[PDB]
Amino acid sequence: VVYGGGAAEVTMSLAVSEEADKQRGIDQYAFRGFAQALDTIPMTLAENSGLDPIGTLSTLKS
Amino acid sequence: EGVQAFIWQEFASALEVIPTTLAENAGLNSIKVVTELRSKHENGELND
């Protein structure tokens, strides 16, 4: 069981960016790409609902 | 702290393509070269 509604995407996204800060290597941008790719589904819901995407993801991330 | 600032971040990120293109034409790894551009510029203000 897991609570969806865009929560599963953002909660898996911020941890990947946190791991990249110490697991930099050559694949530092690879984790950042997957972190930004997971957040697109909340932004997709923002477009269909007609809300501001940046304000939505900024509030959820904060 | 505005949406105009978020566009300026992409303005700064997209402007780094010129040394990235130089790395690919020279065969050097772009991330290793661009990582040195970030490491030397906080002290070196110009001519680096």
Residue of chain B with shortest Cα separation from A52: B3
Resolution (A): 3.2
How far apart CA A56 and CA B13 sit, in angstroms, is 23
Chain B positions touching A28 (Cβ under 8 A) are 31
Tell me which residue has tokens 């996204």: A13
Residue of chain B with shortest Cα separation from A54: B3
Q: Provide the 8-state DSSP code for A47.
A: H
From A27's Cα to the closest Cα of chain B, the distance in A is 10
- From residue B35, alpha-carbon distances to B24, B30, B39 in Å are 15, 8, 6
Method: cryo-EM
How far apart CA A51 and CA B6 sit, in angstroms, is 18
The tally of CA atoms less than 13 A away on the side-chain side of residue A31 is 17
Nearest residue, CB atoms, A54 vs list B3, B29, B32: B3
CA angle B9, B11, B12 (to 5 degrees): 65
